[PDB]
Amino acid sequence: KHNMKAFLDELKAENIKKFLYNFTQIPHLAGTEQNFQLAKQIQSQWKEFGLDSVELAHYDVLLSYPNKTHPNYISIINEDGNEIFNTSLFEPPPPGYENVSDIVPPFSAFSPQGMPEGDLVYVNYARTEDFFKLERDMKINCSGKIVIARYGKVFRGNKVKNAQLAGAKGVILYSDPADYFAPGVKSYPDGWNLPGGGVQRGNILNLNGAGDPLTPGYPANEYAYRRGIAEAVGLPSIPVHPIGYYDAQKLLEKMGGSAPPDSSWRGSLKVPYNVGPGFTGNFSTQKVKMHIHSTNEVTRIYNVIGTLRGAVEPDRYVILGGHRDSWVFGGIDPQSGAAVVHEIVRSFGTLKKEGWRPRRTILFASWDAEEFGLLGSTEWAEENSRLLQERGVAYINADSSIEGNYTLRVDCTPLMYSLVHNLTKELKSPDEGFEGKSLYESWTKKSPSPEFSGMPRISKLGSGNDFEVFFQRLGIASGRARYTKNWETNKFSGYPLYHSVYETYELVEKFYDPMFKYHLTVAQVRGGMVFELANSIVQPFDCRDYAVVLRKYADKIYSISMKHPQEMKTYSVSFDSLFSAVKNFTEIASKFSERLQDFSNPIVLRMMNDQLMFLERAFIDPLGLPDRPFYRHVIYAPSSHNKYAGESFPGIYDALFDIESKVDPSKAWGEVKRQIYVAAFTVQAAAETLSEVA
Amino acid sequence: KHNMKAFLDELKAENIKKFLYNFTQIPHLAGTEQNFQLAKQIQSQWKEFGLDSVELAHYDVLLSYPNKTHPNYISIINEDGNEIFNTSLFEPPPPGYENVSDIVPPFSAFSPQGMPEGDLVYVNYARTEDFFKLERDMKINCSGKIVIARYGKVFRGNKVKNAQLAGAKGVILYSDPADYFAPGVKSYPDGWNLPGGGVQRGNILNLNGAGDPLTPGYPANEYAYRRGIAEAVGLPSIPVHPIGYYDAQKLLEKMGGSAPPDSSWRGSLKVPYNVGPGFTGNFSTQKVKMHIHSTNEVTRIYNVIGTLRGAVEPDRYVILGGHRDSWVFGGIDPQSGAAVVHEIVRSFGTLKKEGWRPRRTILFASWDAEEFGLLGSTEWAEENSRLLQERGVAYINADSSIEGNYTLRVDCTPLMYSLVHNLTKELKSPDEGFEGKSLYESWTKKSPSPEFSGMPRISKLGSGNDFEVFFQRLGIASGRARYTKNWETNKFSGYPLYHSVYETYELVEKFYDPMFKYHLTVAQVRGGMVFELANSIVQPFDCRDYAVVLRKYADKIYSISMKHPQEMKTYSVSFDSLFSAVKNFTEIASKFSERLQDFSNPIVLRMMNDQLMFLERAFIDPLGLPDRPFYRHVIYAPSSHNKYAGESFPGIYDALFDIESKVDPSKAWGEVKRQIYVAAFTVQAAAETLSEVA
Ligand SMILES: O=C(O)CC[C@H](NC(=O)N[C@@H](CCCCn1cc(COCCOCCOCCOCCOCCOCCOCCOCCNc2ccc([N+](=O)O)cc2[N+](=O)O)nn1)C(=O)O)C(=O)O
Ligand SMILES: O=C(O)CC[C@H](NC(=O)N[C@@H](CCCCn1cc(COCCOCCOCCOCCOCCOCCOCCOCCNc2ccc([N+](=O)O)cc2[N+](=O)O)nn1)C(=O)O)C(=O)O
Ligand SMILES: *[C@@H]1O[C@H](CO)[C@@H](O[C@@H]2O[C@H](CO)[C@@H](O[C@@H]3O[C@H](CO)[C@@H](O)[C@H](O[C@H]4O[C@H](CO)[C@@H](O)[C@H](O)[C@@H]4O)[C@@H]3O)[C@H](O)[C@H]2NC(C)=O)[C@H](O)[C@H]1NC(C)=O
Ligand SMILES: *[C@@H]1O[C@H](CO)[C@@H](O[C@@H]2O[C@H](CO)[C@@H](O[C@@H]3O[C@H](CO)[C@@H](O)[C@H](O[C@H]4O[C@H](CO)[C@@H](O)[C@H](O)[C@@H]4O)[C@@H]3O)[C@H](O)[C@H]2NC(C)=O)[C@H](O)[C@H]1NC(C)=O
Ligand SMILES: *[C@@H]1O[C@H](CO)[C@@H](O[C@@H]2O[C@H](CO)[C@@H](O)[C@H](O)[C@H]2NC(C)=O)[C@H](O)[C@H]1NC(C)=O
Ligand SMILES: *[C@@H]1O[C@H](CO)[C@@H](O[C@@H]2O[C@H](CO)[C@@H](O)[C@H](O)[C@H]2NC(C)=O)[C@H](O)[C@H]1NC(C)=O
Ligand SMILES: *[C@@H]1O[C@H](CO)[C@@H](O[C@@H]2O[C@H](CO)[C@@H](O)[C@H](O)[C@H]2NC(C)=O)[C@H](O)[C@H]1NC(C)=O
Ligand SMILES: *[C@@H]1O[C@H](CO)[C@@H](O[C@@H]2O[C@H](CO)[C@@H](O)[C@H](O)[C@H]2NC(C)=O)[C@H](O)[C@H]1NC(C)=O
Ligand SMILES: *[C@@H]1O[C@H](CO)[C@@H](O[C@@H]2O[C@H](CO)[C@@H](O)[C@H](O)[C@H]2NC(C)=O)[C@H](O)[C@H]1NC(C)=O
Ligand SMILES: *[C@@H]1O[C@H](CO)[C@@H](O[C@@H]2O[C@H](CO)[C@@H](O)[C@H](O)[C@H]2NC(C)=O)[C@H](O)[C@H]1NC(C)=O
Ligand SMILES: *[C@@H]1O[C@H](CO)[C@@H](O)[C@H](O)[C@H]1NC(C)=O
Ligand SMILES: *[C@@H]1O[C@H](CO)[C@@H](O)[C@H](O)[C@H]1NC(C)=O
Ligand SMILES: *[C@@H]1O[C@H](CO)[C@@H](O)[C@H](O)[C@H]1NC(C)=O
Ligand SMILES: *[C@@H]1O[C@H](CO)[C@@H](O)[C@H](O)[C@H]1NC(C)=O
Ligand SMILES: *[C@@H]1O[C@H](CO)[C@@H](O)[C@H](O)[C@H]1NC(C)=O
Ligand SMILES: *[C@@H]1O[C@H](CO)[C@@H](O)[C@H](O)[C@H]1NC(C)=O
Ligand SMILES: [Ca+2]
Ligand SMILES: [Ca+2]
Ligand SMILES: [Cl-]
Ligand SMILES: [Cl-]
Ligand SMILES: [Zn+2]
Ligand SMILES: [Zn+2]
Ligand SMILES: [Zn+2]
Ligand SMILES: [Zn+2]
Predict the structure, then answer these.
(1) Mind telling me how many Å the CA of A511 is from chain B's nearest CA?
(2) Which of A361, A390, A618 sits opposite B694 (nearest CB)?
(3) Which of A246, A672, A689, B287 has its CA 20 to 30 A from that of B263?
(4) Per-chain residues with Cβ under 5 A from ion ligand 22
(5) What is the Cα–Cα distance from B323 to B378, expressed in whole angstroms?
(6) What residues sit in the active site (chains A, B)?
């Protein structure tokens, strides 16, 4: 029998291991020949595995690379202009890789060129609240200073935006052991911690969903008209470069000026964490100088797109997508995910060869240039937006399958909560101590829901990965799942070796998942979700779960506003319309659910399946959010302060943020009221899509 | 048997006559009690007729009315400030209506208040090319002058925009007998011509699709947040008022300054048509003074929405809509259309009572506030946009059924051309001399296609009526049809009594259609189109006809560009991508048509019906056209110079318009190239929606 169990049983830990090894022997940086060859390999293999068609979709997009013969570095310079200390030109390569070529040295992708020289100011994590503290409380001015910020807490592009707005003339990012070195674990190669020479690569754009900087709204195809660089979207205006903690300690140790305001500003290095500006007296005439010579260049990228045509509803698409490009070897990011996709395709193809097809079409994607701003997924979705918005059922992401070995992590639309609970109750837990128990049982025990007893935590989607175009631009129900660390006992951010040369096959095989049991579990979750979405007669979405969360988010945004009771009185700021809409949505969803359970008629079914499919679509506002036209979902957007985090009722949230500091309160509260009206209207309009249709 | 013939045979000329009489005895100005009572009457009657549900949908929108106790007028004033001549305070009412109350006096809706005094400049029709001629060739400066313009040729709101941009401080609009008095016909009540005391009402907004000025993008419901007046969309900045030709002659007769540049500037009055500025010597110290005291006021409006639920596809909507509000009695505009809608509803309801239902849902709409900027239709479509864009099959407009008695006029999307040809071959011609012949035969003989022998003319949709939101904003296939005059032998614009108090039941019954045979024919065309769209198994759209016109429009826009061969060389301006896309669309549409004709499988059918329904949708660009975010269709928009006219490839057309006058040619030709890329991309993306889906 060809059912979910058949699909799941065909998945093998040993195959995922073999694929991971295969994908991580050489670097696969976007835009390079090595990553085009891997695209061709995956295309060939997916054909072999049994997909109906497998094509490459290419685009020519703006990418950024260091200059191989003019390396980036930072100096401390003396009064004479002698560079008395220089940061490293590369990370010491790991054992057995010291002869691998084409390892890109650490750099911040899309940095402009420059050689700014100046006094340092230390800005903690460079968050909005860190700059508030510096400017408003400490009265420190960053204008014309080079800022040094520790990585962690928020997306690095928000740090750079924050520093630019503070007037910085350059930014130095570094990895503090406080945030990237777990106590009691050894540095790579002897454990999974970041060594002092390790450095985190990553782009520093602020694209807000636009995709390729030069072609917002349209695919970067063969005839595309491109903006000039000066009009490009999202590029930083000041040079930026990342360093490791051995080099950071040399830059921080001499810092003078003001003491850190409190302990939350102190990392773990043996330095005072003085804010500056500049160095202590004896070194007061020394300065820091950056030398950045990277160049931005339009470069071809390649997505692999595989199709498994549906037997009954070929014009409904369930998409499983993850990226293939990596900063270096991509041992965790992305190849731990790409190897799981590859095994999922193999398992679906095995059923296909035996005569099976899914009810709906499944599309499988190997995206390129994710690391440079979600470029491959976004350009493809721009090209195919009409097809996706009328036919797209769901998008399941597949980046890193592991960032720890403790329990499951799922982020998704509320429409998928019930599907995830049900699927995980049918899967076996891979956890020690949970032998013979369900994944739901282990997950719920280790990661309990904050709101509900006996249920596991499922988070909102943020951004910083390839589901962004599908969810926040196009309104297609989306989700992601991976294995993660224990958030209670672990204070570090992400995993320590993120975007470093040390993210290798050996890191995974030795330290994260030697048996590949957590990878297999993630393959079952991602693959199972795709299976259900593509095969279920009635789409496995529960609109009632959206109703529950909408009330939670309404309560939350009301609570923020109610910190300003005088202003709500003065400007007659009422949330009554939003609560009304949420009440209506709850009532209508309940009635729709009754009809759905209680309706042979394939028209009523598909009519009902379309109401389910277009429900996420109904939260899209075609005018977008203020100054962010590609974030169009009214319930969820990436936080304006941290792209990785999701924010609920973002238009109202950003209207309320720091409102007590606005110079014209009447105008500011007017915009809060406008955003309440937009959100209440959008929730009522989404509810009405679930009413009887005539 | 319940088939189209049964529906058509039930339609009766005598019923349309009775309804027209019923709808035109008192004025039904938007926002007034009389028009709310008529809404309630129509709601009651549509229920009686058999519709499943009939509701009122209300909104509170910005409307504009004269001040009843401070009337608008224009004076000639002397040096002492004595007003020596005043324009009329009202049109002489027609026979038997001299005691009717609540006739709104002539005014320009949405004019600001003011009493500007100054010298006149005569600006012909106030078209873009008239202002070019004044400023560029004649070197006449309108800054600080009051301009007087004749009505005709273009929408009055474009005249006022053009005058404001020229620096005018007020605008006087008048009806010249050249444009509103057909030679050899008597003035009302003795014929259908405009008397010298007649005046054309009408709004002078420039909304570009926005709907209510205060709530662009969102319905003007009970909790809507409204812009302040200063931020409202589309309002004029200078006072404007319309007059008849008796009063115009008094204002024009004294004009001095420059002679008219040529005969195309001369109307039919016994005046020189001097351009000015100002009056001839003896009267040089006299000036013209406007007194405008109208007020803009948020006011409730009511749409009636009737539903006839589909038997098989209740979640597919075919909409027949027309407005109900009128300037005065609305004898032609709109009640000649509303009486036809009413009879269509009655005929559908007769079939319904006998047990029939259409395959798809039919929605019937009586829109309000059309006269004030398409407000009722637009606010309703804003409220229901998610339902309409996922379920809307087609929109058939139903404003004035007649503007002459010569032949048929149809404007619609290419997707409807074949349906219209086929339907009109099955209908009887009402024309004298064509007894026993088809409507197709009479229409084709009287109004031959410019492109094709043996085929009738069908025009593009422009704007200035309630299909605008459905077609140019939302991308729903739309059409309209009415009886019209002989365009060859008739030089006047529209019909002469348009928007005057003289547009009465008697005008229609005595002069246009005494037997109501042309109304009946229009009812058969509109009703038949609705019938087919709602009942046909395969939707009656032919994508191949879009391919033919796309090539025509590509050839046209290429020809405009090729007036600038040097610049196309210098800036490498190529149309190759657009022709490629159009070639691809032609190929793909041909293959789709083969599958459609040659495909029992209701999924393949509905899959194919969705490809047909979403094909008009595919021409929508969610980013809109430059500075006109609510005009989103890439193939068709209202002309930027005349809202009534449609323009093809509008984004490229406006990029090319007057390009030789732009100060930075590199930038201007860059934007032409950007618009070529957007159009080529959009045509290819629409083509791809017709490809096999997987
Ligand atoms: O160009 C681009 O856009 C990106 C390209 C590239 N993409 C990329 O590398 N993506 C990686 C990014 C890895 C990022 C590592 N990272 C994260 C951060 C910090 O950013 C914060 C993440 O958001 C979490 C904020 O939540 C804290 C408040 O909790 C309230 C509920 O959360 C609402 C905020 O929005 C949620 C959406 O995403 C958050 C997912 O995190 C799940 C939270 N789960 C747990 C929470 C608590 C917990 N516990 O025990 O108390 C346990 C949890 N748990 O999952 O077990 N710094 N570094 C990836 O997606 O795998 C790049 O980033 O350079
Ligand atoms: O707020 C609002 O938006 C509007 C509210 C209100 N709405 C309203 O009152 N609507 C009325 C408006 C009546 C307007 C009367 N009017 C029209 C005008 C002039 O505007 C020009 C109309 O566009 C025609 C331009 O075509 C000339 C170039 O010919 C090339 C092909 O046409 C492409 C231009 O776009 C076509 C879209 O609409 C045009 C429909 O006209 C059909 C042309 N048909 C014929 C053409 C030639 C011919 N012939 O024998 O040579 C015969 C034709 N024929 O139909 O038999 N001035 N006054 C209604 O829709 O019934 C208002 O206007 O105040
Ligand atoms: C949640 O769903 C409910 C339906 O169950 C829906 O209720 C609707 O609420 C609106 C108010 O926003 C009601 O609107 C009223 O309509 C009547 C005519 O039916 C009007 O006469 C009312 O206007 C008068 O009163 C106003 C308030 O004092 C005045 O401002 C105004 O000047 C008039 O005097 C008013 O427009 C509507 O009738 C109901 N519909 C129902 C019950 O079916 C509610 O709006 C939904 N929530 C959201 C956010 O959409
Ligand atoms: C109309 O439909 C046709 C398909 O029948 C579609 O043709 C496509 O045209 C594009 C060009 O826009 C082709 O793109 C090429 O793809 C190959 C790989 O397949 C690339 O190697 C090519 O790039 C090289 O050559 C370029 C031109 O000299 C250089 O600029 C570039 O640097 C490279 O050297 C190029 O990208 C594409 O292969 C076909 N697809 C087919 C035939 O299936 C056409 O685009 C459609 N029209 C529109 C407007 O979409
Ligand atoms: C990754 O696996 C692929 C697939 O097995 C290997 O590519 C094959 O290599 C052999 C030997 O060179 C060729 O004969 C095949 O044509 C290749 N198949 C393809 C590309 O589909 C590849 O060598 C492996 N890479 C590594 C680093 O182990
Ligand atoms: C840091 O690197 C810089 C640049 O390579 C070194 O400065 C150079 O030193 C060489 C040899 O002494 C000179 O010929 C160059 O002119 C110098 N260039 C610049 C820009 O100063 C510097 O010596 C290095 N410092 C340390 C401590 O290694
Ligand atoms: C998750 O599983 C639950 C329990 O099986 C499903 O809920 C049941 O659905 C069936 C079929 O409609 C109903 O007859 C039962 O009454 C439901 N039980 C409940 C709600 O406790 C639920 O539909 C599944 N969710 C999915 C598939 O998304
Ligand atoms: C237009 O026709 C309607 C419908 O016949 C007339 O309204 C009816 O009037 C009678 C007599 O006053 C009432 O008893 C009915 O209740 C009305 N029906 C409705 C409103 O649905 C109306 O009088 C006619 N108007 C004119 C000007 O002839
Ligand atoms: C045009 O109308 C104006 C305004 O009503 C007339 O001027 C008024 O005349 C009365 C009576 O003579 C005076 O008391 C008012 O003060 C005048 N008002 C203004 C604004 O001038 C004027 O007489 C009329 N002209 C003609 C030719 O009828
Ligand atoms: C208009 O009528 C024509 C002629 O009947 C229809 O075209 C025919 O369609 C049938 C059914 O698919 C085909 O078998 C014939 O070959 C077609 N004849 C042609 C193209 O000459 C056409 O489909 C009708 N258009 C509509 C209904 O939109
Ligand atoms: C890189 O640096 C070299 C050596 O100084 C220089 O010649 C070249 O222009 C640079 N390359 C790029 C792509 O800018
Ligand atoms: C910060 O420093 C610069 C002077 O170099 C000045 O332009 C800016 O306004 C200062 N801001 C303050 C003191 O808030
Ligand atoms: C794997 O799990 C063990 C047991 O809790 C833990 O000590 C170790 O830190 C984990 N490895 C990683 C990379 O988290
Ligand atoms: C209309 O004019 C009268 C009389 O001069 C004035 O009192 C009133 O304010 C005006 N009405 C409006 C609505 O402006
Ligand atoms: C038209 O007149 C005004 C002077 O009142 C002036 O400001 C404007 O620039 C003039 N334009 C010309 C002469 O082109
Ligand atoms: C009706 O048709 C006759 C015959 O051509 C014509 O003379 C008359 O002008 C028409 N009436 C109108 C209003 O066009
Ligand atoms: Ca793009
Ligand atoms: Ca509105
Ligand atoms: Cl992921
Ligand atoms: Cl019409
Ligand atoms: Zn990744
Ligand atoms: Zn990454
Ligand atoms: Zn009308
Ligand atoms: Zn009108």
Answers:
(1) 42
(2) A361
(3) B287
(4) A 333
(5) 12
(6) 370 (nucleophile), 574 (charge relay system), 610 (charge relay system), 633 (charge relay system)
What lies within 8 Å, CB to CB, of B559 at 6+ separation is: none
Resolution in A: 1.6
Beta strands A53-65; A295-308: pairing state: antiparallel
Q: What is the whole-number distance in angstroms between the Cα of residue B22 and the centre of ligand 8?
A: 8
Ligand nearest to the CA of B25: 8
Return the biggest CA–CA distance within chain A. 86
Cα-trace Rg, chain B: 25
The residues with which A173 forms a beta bridge, in sequence order, are A149, A242
Q: Which of A574, A577, A593, A671 is catalytic?
A: A574
Contact (Cβ atoms closer than 8 angstroms) between residue B106 and residue B201: yes
Q: Which atom of ligand 3 is nearest to the CA of A577?
A: 49
| Of the candidates B543, B542, B574, the residue with the CA atom closest to the CA atom of residue B558 | B574
What DSSP letter does each residue of B554-603 carry, written as one string? HHHHHHHHTT-HHHHHHTT---HHHHHHHHHHHHHHHHHHHHHHH---HH
Catalytic residue list contains B370 = yes
How many alpha carbons fall within 13 Å on the CB side of residue A144?
0
Atom of ligand 9 nearest to the CA of B81: 21
Residues B11, B15: Cα–Cα separation, whole Å: 8
- HSE-up of residue A439 (Cα within 13 Å, Cβ side): 27
* Residue B169 near residue B146 (C-beta atoms within 8 A): yes
A633 is catalytic: yes
Binding residues of A for Ca(2+): 215, 218, 379, 382
In chain B, what are the domains?
A: 1-66+293-540 (3.40.630.10), 67-292 (3.50.30.30), 541-694 (1.20.930.40)
Amino acid at B657: F
Closest CA to A206 of A374, A354, A88, A334: A374
**Among B447, B422, B321, residue whose Cα is nearest residue B376:** B321
Q: b vs e for B363-387, b when ≥16 Cβ sit within 10 Å of the residue's Cβ?
A: bbbbbbbbbbbbbbbbbbbbbbbbb
Tell me which of A60, A325, A370, A411 is the catalytic residue: A370
Supply A42's token pair: 């995956």
For ion ligand 21, residues whose CB falls within 5 Å: A 333-334, 399
Determine contact, residues B120/B146, Cβ cutoff 8 Å. yes
- A610–B678 C-beta distance less than 8 A: no
Instruction: Report the gap between the CA of B320 and the closest CA in chain A (Å).
Output: 15
CA B622 to chain centre: 23
Q: Give me the catalytic one of B176, B370, B545, B647.
A: B370
Question: Which has the closest alpha carbon to B504: B324, B331, B327, B326?
Answer: B331
| 3-class DSSP assignment, residue A167 | coil
3-state secondary structure of B527: helix
Closest-approach residue (CA) in chain A for B361: A694
Closest in A383, A386, A621 to B689, CB measured: A386
The DSSP annotation for B639-679 comes to ETTEEEEEEESHHHHHHHTTGGG-S-HHHHHHHHHHHHHHH
Question: What is the DSSP secondary-structure string of B79-103?
Answer: TT--EEEE--SSPPPPTT-TT---P
Q: In whole angstroms, give the CA distance from residue B152 to residue B166.
A: 19
Catalytic residue status for B600: no
Residue A580 CA to residue B451 CA, distance in Å, equals 56
**Burial (CB count within 10 angstroms: exposed 0-12, middle 13-18, buried 19+), residue A566:** exposed
State the closest ligand 15 atom to the C-alpha of B144, by its place in the atom list counted from 1.
5
Q: State yes or no: is B129 an active-site residue.
A: no
Contacts of B37 (CB under 8 A, 6+ apart): none
**Strands B360-367 and B295-308: what pairing?**
antiparallel
Residues of A in contact with B595 (CB under 8 A): none
